[PDB]
Design a protein around this ligand. Structure first.
Ligand SMILES: *[C@@H]1O[C@H](CO)[C@@H](O[C@@H]2O[C@H](CO)[C@@H](O[C@@H]3O[C@H](CO[C@H]4O[C@H](CO)[C@@H](O)[C@H](O)[C@@H]4O)[C@@H](O)[C@H](O)[C@@H]3O)[C@H](O)[C@H]2NC(C)=O)[C@H](O)[C@H]1NC(C)=O
Ligand SMILES: *[C@@H]1O[C@H](CO)[C@@H](O[C@@H]2O[C@H](CO)[C@@H](O[C@@H]3O[C@H](CO[C@H]4O[C@H](CO)[C@@H](O)[C@H](O)[C@@H]4O)[C@@H](O)[C@H](O)[C@@H]3O)[C@H](O)[C@H]2NC(C)=O)[C@H](O)[C@H]1NC(C)=O
Ligand SMILES: *[C@@H]1O[C@H](CO)[C@@H](O[C@@H]2O[C@H](CO)[C@@H](O[C@@H]3O[C@H](CO[C@H]4O[C@H](CO)[C@@H](O)[C@H](O)[C@@H]4O)[C@@H](O)[C@H](O)[C@@H]3O)[C@H](O)[C@H]2NC(C)=O)[C@H](O)[C@H]1NC(C)=O
Ligand SMILES: N[C@H]1CC[C@H](NC(=O)[C@]23C[C@@H]4C[C@](c5ccccc5)(C2)C[C@@](c2ccccc2)(C4)C3)CC1
Ligand SMILES: N[C@H]1CC[C@H](NC(=O)[C@]23C[C@@H]4C[C@](c5ccccc5)(C2)C[C@@](c2ccccc2)(C4)C3)CC1
Ligand SMILES: N[C@H]1CC[C@H](NC(=O)[C@]23C[C@@H]4C[C@](c5ccccc5)(C2)C[C@@](c2ccccc2)(C4)C3)CC1
Ligand SMILES: *[C@@H]1O[C@H](CO)[C@@H](O)[C@H](O)[C@H]1NC(C)=O
Ligand SMILES: *[C@@H]1O[C@H](CO)[C@@H](O)[C@H](O)[C@H]1NC(C)=O
Ligand SMILES: *[C@@H]1O[C@H](CO)[C@@H](O)[C@H](O)[C@H]1NC(C)=O
Ligand SMILES: *[C@@H]1O[C@H](CO)[C@@H](O)[C@H](O)[C@H]1NC(C)=O
Ligand SMILES: *[C@@H]1O[C@H](CO)[C@@H](O)[C@H](O)[C@H]1NC(C)=O
Ligand SMILES: *[C@@H]1O[C@H](CO)[C@@H](O)[C@H](O)[C@H]1NC(C)=O
Ligand SMILES: *[C@@H]1O[C@H](CO)[C@@H](O)[C@H](O)[C@H]1NC(C)=O
Ligand SMILES: *[C@@H]1O[C@H](CO)[C@@H](O)[C@H](O)[C@H]1NC(C)=O
Ligand SMILES: *[C@@H]1O[C@H](CO)[C@@H](O)[C@H](O)[C@H]1NC(C)=O
Ligand SMILES: *[C@@H]1O[C@H](CO)[C@@H](O)[C@H](O)[C@H]1NC(C)=O
Ligand SMILES: *[C@@H]1O[C@H](CO)[C@@H](O)[C@H](O)[C@H]1NC(C)=O
Ligand SMILES: *[C@@H]1O[C@H](CO)[C@@H](O)[C@H](O)[C@H]1NC(C)=O
Lengths: 121, 238, 121, 238, 121, 238
């Protein structure tokens, strides 16, 4: 489906905060005893509305709430950390969870270079 | 199913579960991101009177918490200390590992009393209370939060100052809630929905520098004389 | 292995309860503040012993206990929610965790339509 | 390895781990289900005397909890409040997020005392205590549970009334446990294994309507005169 | 990268302890009520420095600490149990997360027996 | 990214993330293992004076715990009971489900006082405190731990005696910490870094069998007269 922003307003600029898992630390700053406190682990960025991405995200998160709330109602886990990993597994099962019939629509295998190598032989 | 956002044809879209796009490449779990976006950004009124009307107490519904990895700098956040008239607390202590929202230009700290007819306080519109990378369905006591909603994404493969504004409240969470903005422990201003954060801080400074603070041991309360754009774009005083 | 029910009796009818994660709510019932309490989130169904499925399930759960208990003894997680996701990952590694040798027994790739497309050319 | 159930040739089977069936299709995690099945369904005696003999106290074994997604309506469930003779509790409070089993025709609420020689109470046959979508190796205090066992499955691709029956117990969890069924706080019936739930409720109503309740301040205890199919198929009274 | 042990010393022998999830119990020892206490669930083994494996492991764990600590700083999960499962998912996405171009370097498909079966026909 | 160990060409290596080796076979999650290795094995001094200098108190950093599946028998472990001079505890109680390290030849149980200028006690070199299959960034009170570090691996496809040594400490975690080894509740030995576990046990036995224990109600403290290989390879006494 396409994303139709139906909000009264849109802040088209997204001033965001997050963390970095990879961040190669300078010297000994990775040691918890020497490193930053909880308040100082964040990085910041600014993203504008190119391709209308920012206003779509505001509309996407709004439309996500119903399904998300129904998922939380039906789980007994107090804190849910597994949604994105379960989506990665589902991405693989959608493609590789059955026998892969080559040239079929539900199989992502390309026999292009293999079909040309056989023609050359 | 929970929707997942993806970029096709220079536009964000919801991925069709019943459709398989082999051209879509997911090469590592790092391409998947959960993001939190603030209700502010959609244009909701952020003043304390309007914001508290969106919350309510309910029993029989277990609280739920979901993780999110990146968030938005908020202009307005909220921090509640609400007791019943008998002094019992209305909101639960913050669970271990739940901290306040990390970027707030203004923290509206509200203290007061209300009936609190319910075990937990929920968002009446179904939104979340956003904390430090955790989103909750309920409000925790004395913990700073922004109102927001969560999205999930497939990325395509490749200073900070905060100011606390204190309010006293009576009849919290009812039809007739009264709010006072706090200058010091003995000087308050009758609160209106139209008062912005910037106006409250200039009202506080002008009161401090005009000597309009209480110089007795009793309460002084002022009422400002009566004399459409979002944030990104007794006695009287006339 | 086949499922041999070795219990003294079998209730062949399974009156069951569960939740639904997908359930498209009516209006505003998905909002936790307005929605059902903990006691009213369940759906019900009834399943009979066609193909002897119900009596097999009673026997399957009984035979699962030993392995399950030994798995719980060896984990330090207080509440385990990851068994089914780990089984999905193991399903994919059993098939796609090595190089897929086509026409081999441990590779689920079908070159049928690709072998006929080459014959036509 | 933990067995996984699957349907081949119109029969449920345990999937062979050492064997690979490419015809087996798993297209989403929604095809995987964890289910809980009640010991009732296998024909075990469900009366309070027989059921409590299957539980016991043990120290040095940490409790463990596993999730399950779907369960069976139970005819019999149990809810225990057991103290030692010195008033200290024998069972732990229910952890946060653990609620009682959701569908119980009869809840056998047992209150009493016992030696409780062990930190936690386990199932002697290795079964689980089934709660609201969580299965535990131990009994929690005052929390309704059904005895059951868990299965894991690959699905092939495509009112409610409850009644509480109260018992008093002495010497709980020993060779010589005594049980009394409770009519009111001053009238009890000496409990036998042969007494079904339906018989206890008719015994309670006939006592209430015959005036056989205690009309003093002391205890009245009755003993029923002595005068093979499962549920899906002092003074005397003669 | 290769593993360069840069520690002052190395105990080349690894006397280790662990648990076994599979362990087919003798009779009724799998029942928690009858089974071993927390102190008696462990198995032991001894591994020597063949292929220098033991001294490499001491050096590998040392070099893992920085990345691991930075990962723990950026998570809000109090106890992390999902690192190895996330690595298994990442192993599959690295291979099967896109269209598999046969004979290409980023596709682990072997058309050897299929190319010879076509030549025979 | 977190490194992953793998065996190529008869040598352990770190797997190149940016490189894809189709010959590497991962057929089940059982091939993946997390292991914990003790700092002992790298040659660090294990005596109580040297070991405690590697730990320190810090506020503002939330504790973190990571799981590991297999560990190394330790020669030296540690168990701390540290209070401030006002009797308030310095270390937190062990969270539910965290038990002591399972294999320790010698447990150095240290009791005493210190300033404890920080909410939690961390490893100054970034190492972990290894418990029963859980690794923590902080020390828990009265819980036995080994110092260690964690590795992650792809495997290629295919009695026990413990002895407790008690110490008293003052000024714990400072430049000038004093340590006494405890013979009984009234007899101590001034502790040096050069004293090995085997030497402390022989010093204790010779004191017991020589009658050098305190036979009054007061403290007796001895000082041993002054008269380069790892473990796998007042009054005076002269
Ligand atoms: C996602 O975005 C949606 C659209 O922005 C949000 O919809 C909002 O839904 C709530 C209820 O869930 C509505 O509140 C109700 O309003 C009616 C009457 O409307 C009054 O307020 C409007 C202001 O928009 C005003 O113009 C009218 O004259 C009324 O005075 C009340 O009777 C109800 O009791 C309830 O308060 C919002 O009005 C509605 N917003 C819009 C812009 O339509 C939705 O909540 C978002 N979802 C999440 C999870 O955030
Ligand atoms: C899975 O199903 C199995 C079969 O239904 C269950 O087996 C049960 O295992 C327990 C012990 O774990 C047995 O209890 C023992 O019984 C003996 C003597 O048997 C007495 O009871 C039988 C009634 O069946 C009676 O006929 C005899 O004459 C005896 O009076 C005692 O000496 C032991 O101390 C212990 O009580 C059950 O008898 C046995 N049931 C059957 C039908 O064989 C198994 O427990 C199930 N697993 C789970 C996890 O639920
Ligand atoms: C992984 O292995 C590394 C190498 O074995 C470990 O490196 C250690 O890092 C710490 C700091 O993080 C160093 O301690 C510092 O030492 C300096 C001065 O060194 C003094 O001690 C050495 C003994 O090696 C002695 O020879 C010198 O003359 C000095 O007296 C101090 O100024 C600092 O304040 C701090 O104490 C270790 O020296 C260093 N070890 C080695 C062998 O280089 C690293 O910590 C390991 N990582 C983990 C997570 O365990
Ligand atoms: N370890 C690194 C991996 C990449 C990561 N980056 C993001 O977390 C974005 C960085 C910015 C902003 C964004 C966001 C923040 C808050 C609320 C909503 C969105 C988060 C979205 C993002 C994006 C969204 C949609 C399409 C493309 C990019 C761009 C990703 C930084 C750390
Ligand atoms: N979101 C929807 C996805 C499908 C889901 N359905 C089940 O949870 C079944 C619904 C019924 C009964 C069953 C069960 C309940 C309790 C105990 C044991 C089993 C659970 C087994 C089930 C089944 C078992 C074996 C083969 C085929 C079906 C049929 C699935 C309903 C919600
Ligand atoms: N369910 C069974 C699956 C296999 C499992 N075995 C291991 O847990 C090893 C058993 C030994 C020792 C080892 C280890 C222990 C402590 C610290 C570091 C390593 C752990 C490493 C191991 C190994 C390492 C590297 C290459 C090959 C083997 C050999 C695996 C036993 C239970
Ligand atoms: C106050 O609340 C009551 C009940 O919630 C309602 O009847 C009334 O309309 C509300 N408003 C006022 C102004 O009293
Ligand atoms: C104002 O009141 C608060 C709480 O009652 C108190 O902590 C603070 O010290 C007071 N400030 C002054 C200046 O008295
Ligand atoms: C009000 O003004 C005084 C004067 O500088 C200042 O100290 C105080 O912090 C102000 N209050 C707020 C909430 O900013
Ligand atoms: C004392 O209070 C009065 C009334 O609030 C005010 O007019 C006066 O300025 C105050 N005193 C000083 C010194 O400001
Ligand atoms: C009671 O228990 C004891 C010990 O558990 C045992 O000796 C005895 O046989 C049991 N039964 C009776 C009837 O005493
Ligand atoms: C019976 O006893 C219980 C607990 O002792 C008490 O809560 C209840 O009110 C009593 N009922 C009557 C009718 O006294
Ligand atoms: C016993 O009978 C009385 C009479 O109606 C009833 O009120 C009471 O609830 C009954 N007790 C039980 C346990 O059903
Ligand atoms: C009083 O108790 C006696 C004995 O239990 C019983 O026979 C009698 O019926 C009771 N009174 C009434 C009014 O029922
Ligand atoms: C003691 O600690 C202080 C401050 O931490 C420092 O100045 C001094 O060098 C240390 N050592 C001694 C021997 O005082
Ligand atoms: C020594 O002291 C400890 C703690 O103060 C105490 O528990 C123990 O019983 C004492 N031992 C003797 C022999 O007095
Ligand atoms: C010290 O020696 C005595 C004498 O046998 C013994 O009982 C005691 O346990 C010893 N202490 C330690 C810490 O080994
Ligand atoms: C009593 O204490 C003294 C001094 O510590 C020691 O010399 C003597 O041997 C002790 N008594 C006995 C009987 O050992």
């Amino acid at each position: 489906e396409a994303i139709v922003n139906a909000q009264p307003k849109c802040n088209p600029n997204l001033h965001y905060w997050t963390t970095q898992d990879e961040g190669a630390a300078i010297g000994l700053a990775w040691i918890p005893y020497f490193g930053p406190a909880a308040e100082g682990i964040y990085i910041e960025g600014l993203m504008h509305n190119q391709d209308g991405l920012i206003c779509g995200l505001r509309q996407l998160a709004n439309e996500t709430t119903q399904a998300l709330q129904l998922f939380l109602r039906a789980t007994t886990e107090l804190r849910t950390f597994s949604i994105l990993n379960r989506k990665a597994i589902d991405f693989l099962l959608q493609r590789w969870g059955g026998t892969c019939h080559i040239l079929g629509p539900d199989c992502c295998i390309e026999p292009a270079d293999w079909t040309k190598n056989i023609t050359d032989k | 199913s929970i929707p997942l956002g993806v970029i096709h044809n220079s536009a964000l879209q919801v991925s069709d579960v019943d459709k398989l796009v082999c051209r879509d490449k997911l090469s590592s779990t790092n391409q998947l991101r959960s993001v939190g976006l603030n209700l502010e950004g959609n244009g909701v009124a952020t003043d304390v009177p309007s914001a508290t009307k969106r919350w309510g107490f309910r029993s029989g519904v277990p609280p739920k918490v979901v993780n999110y990895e990146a968030g938005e700098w908020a202009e307005n956040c909220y921090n509640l200390e609400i007791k019943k008239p008998d002094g019992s607390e209305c909101l639960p202590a913050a669970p271990d590992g739940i901290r306040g929202f990390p970027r707030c230009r203004y923290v509206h700290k509200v203290s007061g009393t209300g009936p609190c007819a319910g075990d937990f306080a929920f968002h009446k519109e179904g939104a979340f209370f956003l904390y430090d990378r955790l989103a909750s369905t309920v409000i925790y006591r004395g913990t700073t939060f922004a109102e927001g909603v969560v999205a999930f994404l497939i990325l395509p493969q490749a200073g900070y100052y905060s100011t606390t504004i204190r309010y006293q409240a009576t009849g919290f969470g009812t039809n007739e809630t009264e709010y006072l903005f706090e200058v010091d422990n003995l000087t308050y201003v009758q609160l209106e929905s139209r008062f912005t954060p910037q106006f409250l801080l200039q009202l506080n400074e002008t009161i401090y520098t005009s000597g309009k603070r209480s110089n007795t041991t009793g309460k002084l309360i002022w009422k400002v004389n009566p004399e459409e754009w979002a944030f990104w774009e007794x006695x009287x005083x006339x």
